[PDB]
């Protein structure tokens, strides 16, 4: 019995709303951070660079006992969407390949879903203003769930090329104030989302409102950065994975910042959410997050 | 852009002649052993323990600049023991071109790489071949070794003699079934170990001076097929030093010195001591899976 293939449109049908992903992801992150008592086996992501094409192949395997599912997501990103992904789903009991599915929409919706979880815990009292840095796939996915989950009075956006932000602004529903600089976009912003593939810092702490929350999603490479030192050093730093951040996050590696806690620890109440101080959630993506989503799809697909 | 799926039989048809599999395997091994300047990017394999089901998931990604190929092998082994899938990507844009069964590929390249080491390291007058084990790898090894070499006597030992006899009357030529490892390896010139043994079964005291051993089995850091004596007194060749020092219980638990990588011998950097007793420890490498995958895909897309 050959494995089933699930198209991008097959997946989204059996995926449904991005915020429906939230409670299972909350469980996955907590289980992960619980370590040996959490049932999650997840080594740090293996990345092989394709220098000849300025690209990378990410391989993210995971087993999760609670979901009893065995997965591997393979993602290529190059500096045809920039990010291409496929998820493999195995029978954890015998090991046969069950399904090969398009991983792009899972990646987009799950990443947005995790940022929202961290945002819900860490956004300051009186979070009226949201700012989005970037205008790619993740920006759309984050915009959809953040306007769904939260109630911002104003949304700002900056992109490297202003045309794509204005395009973004006119495509999405609801008003978007396109700003020509990051300084303008984040000034007075209570929640900031950085979803660019920049490699040198675009976000400087001096522009950041005291107590603001930052979701740093991009710069998933040891030599890449989105944030400067002042922000990385002065803010309370949360990550999805401590082992992954110390190996793959240039924002963490180069700044020399102390990781305060893993987001899963907070979810379980093992660590506090300092919503009143300036916070940074540095997200690098974890295989267990993909696991949960792909498991939801196949199970739906099977019924 | 839905990926292609090649069945095991489909892969099996694209890999008929070994006379097309070994030359690119040799080239790949040569380039790998050169390090990064050789153009092969191959992280040590990641293994996910699934003790909950007494099983493992092996993950083996690779890129090669020389043939511009980007692949990932995903192997699962449980207690068909080994189930593999090989993914082939487009290097320039990252799209997944194909998903193929990787059990046939695994069997083929493993047997072929062993034959490459054997062709180089077998002693003068190699008349007796000895196979320890009777699984998938024993078959694939037997087919290529009898095609490539010319032994007068082929022997086999297996933990379950029933399986050894089923092997003996399935393969074409005459295989002599033995009731002990010592009986099988005594006087043997080439020895192939493809067992799931976790504690030493092959002992240096039994091994003919000058014999070549292809140790393929034990690929977990606490499992081993060969004893301290043999590991330390033979000239030790591996596919990868980095994998060996991580995953080979045979090498780690004996403190044995690695003389060379196989690619180093193919390239000319290190000599093939065919007159000394030699051991080639194969752990399996992502680039070997890559080579086969590209060969299959090139033929398939023609
Ligand atoms: N943490 C996680 O879980 C995951 C993280 N990501 C990361 O997030 C980022 C966005 O992903 P995605 O939306 O799919 O990619 P996209 O290609 O769809 O979007 C790229 C965005 O980043 C901008 N960009 C590219 N280079 C630069 C640069 N040098 N400087 C400033 N902006 C730049 C682009 O702007 P422009 O219009 O000028 O091209 C665009 O706004 C990536 O870096 C990705 O690696 C996504 C996967 C999940
Ligand atoms: N180096 C490489 O490139 C790769 C290495 N391998 C490794 O090679 C070995 C064989 O692979 P494969 O043929 O596919 O596996 P199989 O399941 O097809 O065959 C298993 C063989 O090992 C024997 N065996 C099981 N337990 C023991 C034991 N305690 N002692 C001695 N023999 C035992 C079995 O005998 P019985 O008849 O009793 O079952 C059988 O002969 C494995 O260890 C595998 O991990 C395979 C992938 C490629």
UniProtKB/Swiss-Prot annotation, chain A:
Expressed in the spiral ligament of the cochlea (at protein level). The keyword Nucleotide-binding does not apply. NADPH binds at residues 82-83, 110, 135, 137-138, 159-161, 164, 196-197, 217, 283. It catalyses: L-pipecolate + NADP(+) = Delta(1)-piperideine-2-carboxylate + NADPH + H(+); L-pipecolate + NAD(+) = Delta(1)-piperideine-2-carboxylate + NADH + H(+); L-proline + NADP(+) = 1-pyrroline-2-carboxylate + NADPH + H(+); L-proline + NAD(+) = 1-pyrroline-2-carboxylate + NADH + H(+). GO terms for molecular function: hormone binding; NADP binding; protein homodimerization activity; thiomorpholine-carboxylate dehydrogenase activity; thyroid hormone binding; transcription corepressor activity. Pfam families: OCD_Mu_crystall (PF02423). 3,3',5-triiodo-L-thyronine binds at residues 45, 248. GO terms for cellular component: cytosol; mitochondrion; nucleus. InterPro entries: NAD(P)-bd_dom_sf, ODC_Mu_crystall, ODC_N. It is found in: Cytoplasm. Its EC number is 1.5.1.25, 1.5.1.1. Keywords: Cytoplasm, NAD, NADP, Oxidoreductase. GO terms for biological process: negative regulation of transcription by RNA polymerase II; sensory perception of sound; thyroid hormone metabolic process; thyroid hormone transport. It comes from the Eukaryota. Belongs to the ornithine cyclodeaminase/mu-crystallin family. Homodimer. Binds the thyroid hormone triiodothyronine (T3); T3 binding inhibits enzymatic activity. Catalyzes the NAD(P)H-dependent reduction of imine double bonds of a number of cyclic ketimine substrates, including sulfur-containing cyclic ketimines. Under physiological conditions, it efficiently catalyzes delta(1)-piperideine-2-carboxylate (P2C) and delta(1)-pyrroline-2-carboxylate (Pyr2C) reduction, suggesting a central role in lysine and glutamate metabolism. Additional substrates are delta(2)-thiazoline-2-carboxylate (T2C), 3,4-dehydrothiomorpholine-3-carboxylate (AECK), and (R)-lanthionine ketimine (LK) that is reduced at very low rate compared to other substrates. This is Ketimine reductase mu-crystallin. The gene is Crym.
